[PDB]
Amino acid sequence: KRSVLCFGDSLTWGWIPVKESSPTLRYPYEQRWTGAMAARLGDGYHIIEEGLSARTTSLDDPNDARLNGSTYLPMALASHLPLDLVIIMLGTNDTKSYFHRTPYEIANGMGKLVGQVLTCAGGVGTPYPAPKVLVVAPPPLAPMPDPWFEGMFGGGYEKSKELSGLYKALADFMKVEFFAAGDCISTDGIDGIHLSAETNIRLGHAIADKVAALF
Amino acid sequence: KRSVLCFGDSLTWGWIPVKESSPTLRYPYEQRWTGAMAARLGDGYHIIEEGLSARTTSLDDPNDARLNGSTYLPMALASHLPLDLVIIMLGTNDTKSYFHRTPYEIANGMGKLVGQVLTCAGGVGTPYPAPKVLVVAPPPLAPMPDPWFEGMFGGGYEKSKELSGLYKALADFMKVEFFAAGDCISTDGIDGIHLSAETNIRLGHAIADKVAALF
Amino acid sequence: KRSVLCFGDSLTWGWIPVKESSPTLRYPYEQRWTGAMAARLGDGYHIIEEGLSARTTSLDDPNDARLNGSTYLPMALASHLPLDLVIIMLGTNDTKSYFHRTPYEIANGMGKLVGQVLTCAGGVGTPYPAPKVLVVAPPPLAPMPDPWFEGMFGGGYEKSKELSGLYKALADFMKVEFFAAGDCISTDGIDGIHLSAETNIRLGHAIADKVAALF
Amino acid sequence: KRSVLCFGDSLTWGWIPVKESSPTLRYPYEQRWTGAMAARLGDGYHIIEEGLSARTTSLDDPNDARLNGSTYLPMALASHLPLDLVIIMLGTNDTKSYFHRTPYEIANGMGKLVGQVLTCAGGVGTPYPAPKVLVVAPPPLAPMPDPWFEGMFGGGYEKSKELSGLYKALADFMKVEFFAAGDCISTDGIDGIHLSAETNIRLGHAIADKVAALF
Amino acid sequence: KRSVLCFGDSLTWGWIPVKESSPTLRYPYEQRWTGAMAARLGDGYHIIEEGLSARTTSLDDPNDARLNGSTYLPMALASHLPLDLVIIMLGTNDTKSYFHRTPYEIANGMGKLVGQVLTCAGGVGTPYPAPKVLVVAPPPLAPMPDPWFEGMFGGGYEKSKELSGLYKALADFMKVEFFAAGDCISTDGIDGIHLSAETNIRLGHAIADKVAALF
Amino acid sequence: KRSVLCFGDSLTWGWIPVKESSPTLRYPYEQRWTGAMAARLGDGYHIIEEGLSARTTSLDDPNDARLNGSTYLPMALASHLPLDLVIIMLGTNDTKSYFHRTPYEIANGMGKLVGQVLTCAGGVGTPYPAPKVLVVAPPPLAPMPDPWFEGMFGGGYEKSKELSGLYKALADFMKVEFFAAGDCISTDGIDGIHLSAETNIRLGHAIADKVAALF
Amino acid sequence: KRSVLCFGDSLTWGWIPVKESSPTLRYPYEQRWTGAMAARLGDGYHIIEEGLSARTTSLDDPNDARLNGSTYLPMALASHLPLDLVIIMLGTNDTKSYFHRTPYEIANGMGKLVGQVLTCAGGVGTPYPAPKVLVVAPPPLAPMPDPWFEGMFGGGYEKSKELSGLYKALADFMKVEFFAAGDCISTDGIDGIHLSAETNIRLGHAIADKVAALF
Amino acid sequence: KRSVLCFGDSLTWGWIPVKESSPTLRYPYEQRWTGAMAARLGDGYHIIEEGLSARTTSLDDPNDARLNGSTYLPMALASHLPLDLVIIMLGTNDTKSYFHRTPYEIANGMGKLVGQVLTCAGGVGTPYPAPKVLVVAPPPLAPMPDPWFEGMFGGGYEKSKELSGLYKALADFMKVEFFAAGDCISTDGIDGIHLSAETNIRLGHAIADKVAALF
């Protein structure tokens, strides 16, 4: 059996876009991209979900101590070995206005996460090798009707558009795999940030085909 | 389905005891207590595994920044809501010689984790409620033929015999559920620390019976 | 009775504007907005005052470790449960020149405080629920004849004009209550920052009307 | 009018002792020692309550960031100036097993708090003088029927018996006022830690007589 | 007798300007402003020198842990009580290119130091009162022939010109004394930063007049 | 002139022992050991006083951030170069009950300070060499009639008796100078900690004789 | 023999420029500038290599805790005394996009390292003197065909052109030696960052000529 | 060619024992164990010396920030790749009186260093594999004539005697190589801590045999 760890933010947790913006409920597994990917990959794969709303690549959020992805990823890797592949879809939250990050710095944060996977061989007391890495660039942001979300992501749209190219450059440099979500889907939720079930399913099917071919 | 997050150390990850002590392989899912519990609970339950070898309740390990359970649990809870129950089986590693913790301090560390579950309602932007908690006392340690493990757990056996009584008192105080694993299993692995497959399966079946009676 | 905690800066503490700028005396209770609110609400309400001159939403002041509102609020909430409502009037001091904060960052700091209220249920060992929240936008700044105050608030007037709209958006997003003080009062003190007794009393009466309609 | 700040733990917050140990409700104001003291002092005094369950003199609690009294007292003083007197009743929680503090270290923590009052003149931008200080030694602990509380306070009884003498020595040295609660009341709650309403009322009346005579 | 603490940077230590820029020797006491001030004041005054080359008001220097004035001043005050007056001449080093401080932030750092004096009453275990404060704005910088010093103070000249006005506003606001060194002297050393002996003597005489007028 | 920096605690600052223990006044210069030493050395020497009540060698005091000698000494050395000699009389406060330091640890803290002197050559931008070092063991403690001082120094008398032998061994190892004050004076103040004026003067005269023999 | 410590980044470690950018192999010693220098200096000299890919002067890299040169240099100096000369070639990595450092700040970081060498006399328990220092400006950057390297060094080329002039000014100020590598070599590797073997050898020969002229 | 990194304390740096204890000179390379090992191994081996007097396995020394071995080892590994073998001889300094470490904690600190080698594959941007590890238990301490050294190592002899057995157990557990220096040499220097030249040579020859047998 092959084990695949899916590390992400609200797009991976499965945030349902809603007209009142927040709070919201979670998509059932079969309507998450992770579940749709698992269905297409089949029973030879075991999918592990680690999606956290508002998670960044490598930034401490001023209002929530839980959100730095790089703080949690080493622990998660060691908890889930043996792993064949880690899929990482993050970066959208790094584009928020109050973080003042350049696109390159966001990609460099993704690079920190890739390095944490590449150096994780052995975990705590095992002979297991490092898994492969699939870097996923999230789809670009869209216009947002809610003024709080619009303020939250001020300046972020242009940054989100640059991530695909920079993540491709990063993945080539670090000799790992790459997939641009925006080549297959768009951000289609009413809030301009999150995704519909149908788009989650299309995304998971497409990632499944990438996974099946990358080993 | 009812979601059950299983938070623990190597006993939960599934460390196979071996003659060379370390390193070792992972039990397959159906030979882990988590998988055996999942099998007896049936398809109305969804099990989430968060087991990490060498994890403590609330201590920083001097050689490994991944191992403080309380550093990770809030992030894990928010990543996995909605949750109906969190089962926590930890404390054995707090008995290691170099931590110099009293049994009450170990139970108080378990209490820190219980509190993190009880106050987690809402996660990141959801209306979901806090789950129930099942505190599990691990079975006492056993003779260790490897001198490195014997030094690692110097003074720990006597502390391990006190955890069950103190965890019961904690659980009554905090108004959560409690299971004494040592009434049903013993630490039967060749290394004096870990468990056989047959014992994992017995444990998981016993925990499943306890969980079913809560719902 | 219904308990109302009033969390704020000098506008809440009751700084009397004076020709020498500083130091100054405190308005008596019946000339504070808190006391005037208490008088119009009547004996079914119990007011708790937590006003601190120079307090910010969520910033460490370089000269004074007492001034980060978010450092203190969780302790204050647990000390005063049971609470029915928390009124927060802060943000003016975040506009000071040496903080270099954008208006969105100031509102996001207010959001940190709102979240601290919303997640405070139980306090230390109680069954009490989280109180409601009333976010109050302070009135915009005014001309400052003292050159030290003018330097202190350089760039702050323009930011102060944006807080009301952003606080309304925050409150709608977090599903709490909102009052724009600038619809009812102006910053009428001689120093361009603080308020007259007549204006405090008008503010408190207006807030009282808002509070009564919540219960 | 004279203003009196009452800084304390669950004995000041007003924890009702209950057979299930925890959680519990709060005494109404007239059944707290603060309220009973205010009734006896009369309308020439304004009492300010700052009681926090589980609060220590100057220790960080491993499971709760809210509980170090010395972290909060400077902020509270500046928020409540002008003050004529600060009454401090703390130390019981410093005797808990997991803190491993000697009686002298507990008294030295009380001394830290006394110094914070004595040096607080001016607050933020006022001409107000430092208030007087009344150090109150809490009554000694009693036997505890609940095993979690008994473990929590292991070794604490003897420490609690030494605080009166050491706090008297401290108050004489620092030239402030002293009152031994144990000379008037005993710890009479079922849990061995907290107080009955009748004892709260006796205590507040006795502190009121001390206050009226100390200026 | 009355004691006067002189807290400063190289202008107070007595750096002799030299063509090679650095290193250099110290002026003898009678050619320092402190010694010249002491001579004019007479033997009714005890002068304490605390001058440190490269010292800032309140900034940590990246290359030298000794240079934050506000880190050392509280210790120095307590070491030198009883004190009648503290003279503070700092701010020039805050204008260095790599600190990126605005003039207001520099004056606010001076304000931090003024506050440390005003709150220092008692020291460690004494009845002594807080000293008075004389804020001294240093003379503006001059053109600098050495390229390393020119880079070191890039952007600093304009900032140094603004300190007099801002320090005057600060001293009025905090109700302390003020003296503009630039009303009496100029920066006349060959390096564009430090002062000649005759200028130190003129400066010390003028400061002595200010000190004598206060007492 | 030869410059001599005197770095110490209350014995150097000049704490007057008094019947009420604290607070107290400072001995005049002529009644300090520093001033008595200066008089006997004469006008070829320049004495710099750096005495701070309650100062330790290298410990952070829980109640006062001013008191770690090793935190302040590097800044003080650079402020006072050129220096021919640093006299260090510290260690008594390290024997306080709440520090739990062994006598060797106290001498090792003295060693930290000696090293700071030996490595201080050049200061900030000077060619000056490192000064010589005179390590002074303070006299042992004596009976303490005040219960607060008795508790403060519990266990400390026996440690104070060992400092001289250990400081001699330190000074020989580090190749610096050593004077045992306890051969010439005893702790004669009423409080069992501090010194009479007559004893200060005898100490300073004895240290002066030692200093002169070094040059 | 005369001992020469060579402290640097990938230019010193010997990164082989390659078409796929990363990862890469290390030049053999004979193809490193260090080994080429050693050969030309001959057997009267002993070369110590301390080159680390990605090392900065004095910056913490967000992704790698190994890379701050100033964190490691004091330990390295004490490990290798006696030393006659330290050659430092660093600064290129400080020009990376995500550090946002000005050229003067980069030279000031070099200055931090120079100071660490100049103040290292004695090491741990030795009489050895501080070595001489040779500051080496690296050659300017060149076109970078890999998009990841291009982003990594955005803004850096222009900064790299200013380092030589600033390092010369630093070395004159601090009274140490200076060599401009860009007078003798250019950045000739395919990646626009690293060097060919022929260029390493030419550099080492030119540095050897400089070193010999110092002794 | 194969590269061998020698990571150690004064026994590796080459401290010459001397009657005055300290300071002292360094043995020439051919009288160090490293140089003697290199001579026996031949020119197919490249030896890298990283010895630092007073270095510990994993402890911060109170008086010197340079001495934690585990702080420096990751940087040194990355600087010296490609490496075939890392030889680690440390632990003697962890036995010093003021560290209060148990023998197991010392061996666990060695374990931290072993783990840093085993996880170092790649360094910064290379394909190189992790080196092998040779753990060397240092020879036990001897009686020490100097009282400062005797105090420094109080309690340490017994601890030093236990390191061989514990390091053997550690090396077996971690599956690396082990050599007991005390099976071949004794601590023969006059100070009871360091070694003679002939003993360094015998030690290096015996370690070379171990190294050659591995390859």
Side-chain angles (χ1 to χ4, degrees), chain F residues 48-212:
Chain F
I48 300 155
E49 297 182 282
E50 294 288 358
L52 174 62
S53 295
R55 171 177 277 154
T56 67
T57 64
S58 62
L59 291 168
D60 291 336
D61 191 290
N63 289 10
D64 192 333
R66 296 171 294 193
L67 303 181
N68 183 329
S70 76
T71 300
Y72 181 102
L73 183 61
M75 288 180 271
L77 292 170
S79 300
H80 295 292
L81 296 181
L83 287 174
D84 297 281
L85 177 68
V86 181
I87 305 172
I88 313 175
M89 185 162 56
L90 286 170
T92 300
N93 292 318
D94 298 45
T95 74
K96 284 176 180 183
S97 59
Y98 53 82
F99 287 128
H100 306 281
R101 194 161 253 199
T102 67
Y104 189 85
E105 289 168 342
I106 302 177
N108 194 58
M110 176 65 76
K112 187 181 178 189
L113 303 176
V114 174
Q116 289 175 332
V117 179
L118 294 177
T119 192
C120 81
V124 181
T126 84
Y128 292 120
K132 291 179 170 292
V133 178
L134 174 59
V135 171
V136 179
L141 292 163
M144 300 158 184
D146 181 87
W148 189 246
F149 271 146
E150 183 184 344
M152 190 182 297
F153 284 98
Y157 169 63
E158 288 293 347
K159 299 175 184 184
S160 79
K161 288 170 54 182
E162 304 302 341
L163 296 187
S164 187
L166 290 165
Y167 283 15
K168 180 148 76 157
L170 171 69
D172 288 345
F173 184 92
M174 294 193 80
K175 310 293 176 287
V176 301
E177 309 285 342
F178 173 68
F179 177 73
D183 293 332
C184 300
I185 61 152
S186 61
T187 301
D188 66 341
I190 185 68
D191 58 15
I193 300 153
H194 302 106
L195 309 178
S196 73
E198 66 157 30
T199 283
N200 283 344
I201 290 168
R202 175 171 189 82
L203 177 64
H205 289 169
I207 295 171
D209 293 347
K210 178 84 177 175
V211 169

Side-chain angles (χ1 to χ4, degrees), chain E residues 11-143:
Chain E
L11 307 175
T12 297
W13 183 75
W15 180 290
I16 301 172
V18 295
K19 69 156 66 282
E20 333 259 323
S21 295
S22 175
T24 196
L25 299 167
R26 196 179 186 184
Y27 281 111
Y29 182 59
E30 295 304 344
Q31 287 189 333
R32 310 209 273 263
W33 77 254
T34 49
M37 184 196 62
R40 182 83 131 219
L41 287 173
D43 60 37
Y45 287 82
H46 169 235
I47 273 64
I48 301 151
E49 301 182 278
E50 294 290 357
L52 175 64
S53 295
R55 177 178 272 152
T56 69
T57 65
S58 57
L59 291 160
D60 293 334
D61 190 289
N63 290 9
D64 188 334
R66 295 171 290 188
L67 304 181
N68 185 325
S70 74
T71 300
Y72 182 98
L73 184 60
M75 289 182 259
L77 293 166
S79 300
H80 296 302
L81 289 185
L83 290 174
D84 298 85
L85 178 64
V86 180
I87 306 174
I88 311 177
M89 187 168 55
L90 286 170
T92 302
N93 292 313
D94 298 47
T95 76
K96 289 179 179 180
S97 60
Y98 55 81
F99 288 130
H100 303 281
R101 193 162 253 202
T102 65
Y104 190 81
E105 289 166 344
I106 302 181
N108 195 55
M110 177 63 75
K112 184 181 183 185
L113 302 174
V114 175
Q116 287 173 337
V117 182
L118 296 178
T119 64
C120 82
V124 181
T126 87
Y128 290 128
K132 294 177 167 54
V133 179
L134 175 61
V135 173
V136 181
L141 294 168

Side-chain angles (χ1 to χ4, degrees), chain F residues 3-17:
Chain F
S3 285
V4 184
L5 189 150
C6 302
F7 194 64
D9 57 25
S10 272
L11 303 181
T12 296
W13 180 79
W15 178 293
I16 302 176

Side-chain angles (χ1 to χ4, degrees), chain H residues 155-204:
Chain H
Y157 168 70
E158 295 72 10
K159 301 181 185 179
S160 76
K161 274 175 53 176
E162 290 181 44
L163 297 188
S164 183
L166 291 166
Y167 286 17
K168 178 73 186 171
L170 166 73
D172 288 345
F173 184 93
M174 296 190 75
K175 310 290 174 289
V176 299
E177 306 294 324
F178 174 69
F179 177 66
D183 289 350
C184 171
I185 64 152
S186 68
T187 301
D188 64 345
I190 180 50
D191 58 15
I193 297 155
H194 306 103
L195 315 172
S196 72
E198 60 85 15
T199 284
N200 284 341
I201 293 167
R202 165 147 150 107
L203 178 60

Side-chain angles (χ1 to χ4, degrees), chain G residues 104-212:
Chain G
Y104 189 85
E105 289 168 342
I106 302 177
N108 194 58
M110 176 65 76
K112 187 181 178 189
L113 303 176
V114 174
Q116 289 175 332
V117 179
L118 294 177
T119 192
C120 81
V124 181
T126 84
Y128 292 120
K132 291 179 170 292
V133 178
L134 174 59
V135 171
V136 179
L141 292 163
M144 300 158 184
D146 181 87
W148 189 246
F149 271 146
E150 183 184 344
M152 190 182 297
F153 284 98
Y157 169 63
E158 288 293 347
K159 299 175 184 184
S160 79
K161 288 170 54 182
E162 304 302 341
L163 296 187
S164 187
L166 290 165
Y167 283 15
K168 180 148 76 157
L170 171 69
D172 288 345
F173 184 92
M174 294 193 80
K175 310 293 176 287
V176 301
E177 309 285 342
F178 173 68
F179 177 73
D183 293 332
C184 300
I185 61 152
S186 61
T187 301
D188 66 341
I190 185 68
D191 58 15
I193 300 153
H194 302 106
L195 309 178
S196 73
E198 66 157 30
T199 283
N200 283 344
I201 290 168
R202 175 171 189 82
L203 177 64
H205 289 169
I207 295 171
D209 293 347
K210 178 84 177 175
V211 169

Side-chain angles (χ1 to χ4, degrees), chain D:
Chain D
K1 237 209 185 196
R2 293 169 167 170
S3 289
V4 184
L5 175 68
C6 302
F7 196 64
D9 58 27
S10 60
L11 310 175
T12 297
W13 184 74
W15 180 290
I16 300 176
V18 293
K19 67 170 175 173
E20 45 125 55
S21 293
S22 175
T24 198
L25 305 166
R26 194 183 187 183
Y27 281 112
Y29 183 63
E30 297 298 349
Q31 289 183 343
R32 305 205 283 262
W33 75 258
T34 46
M37 184 192 68
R40 173 77 161 167
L41 283 168
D43 292 352
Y45 290 81
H46 172 237
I47 271 65
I48 301 150
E49 299 182 278
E50 293 290 357
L52 177 61
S53 300
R55 173 178 275 151
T56 70
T57 63
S58 56
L59 287 159
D60 295 330
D61 190 285
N63 293 5
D64 191 329
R66 293 170 300 188
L67 302 181
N68 184 328
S70 77
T71 300
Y72 182 100
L73 183 60
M75 287 181 270
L77 295 166
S79 300
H80 298 299
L81 292 186
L83 289 174
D84 298 85
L85 174 65
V86 179
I87 303 172
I88 310 174
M89 187 168 55
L90 286 172
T92 300
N93 293 315
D94 296 48
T95 74
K96 289 181 176 179
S97 60
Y98 54 82
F99 286 133
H100 301 285
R101 264 211 168 164
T102 65
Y104 190 83
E105 290 166 339
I106 303 180
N108 196 53
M110 173 65 76
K112 185 183 183 184
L113 299 176
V114 174
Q116 289 174 337
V117 180
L118 293 180
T119 66
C120 81
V124 185
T126 83
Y128 289 129
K132 293 173 182 302
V133 182
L134 177 59
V135 171
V136 184
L141 293 166
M144 298 160 289
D146 181 84
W148 188 247
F149 270 148
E150 193 179 332
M152 191 184 298
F153 285 96
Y157 168 69
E158 167 265 294
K159 298 178 186 186
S160 76
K161 286 287 282 184
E162 289 190 24
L163 299 185
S164 180
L166 290 169
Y167 284 19
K168 185 184 226 252
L170 166 73
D172 286 347
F173 183 95
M174 293 188 77
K175 309 291 173 293
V176 303
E177 305 293 334
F178 173 72
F179 181 78
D183 290 354
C184 292
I185 61 150
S186 66
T187 299
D188 65 343
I190 186 165
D191 59 13
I193 296 155
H194 304 101
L195 314 173
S196 72
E198 157 275 320
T199 285
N200 285 341
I201 288 159
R202 289 201 290 98
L203 177 61
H205 291 173
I207 293 176
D209 288 347
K210 182 78 182 181
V211 171
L214 72 75
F215 47 16

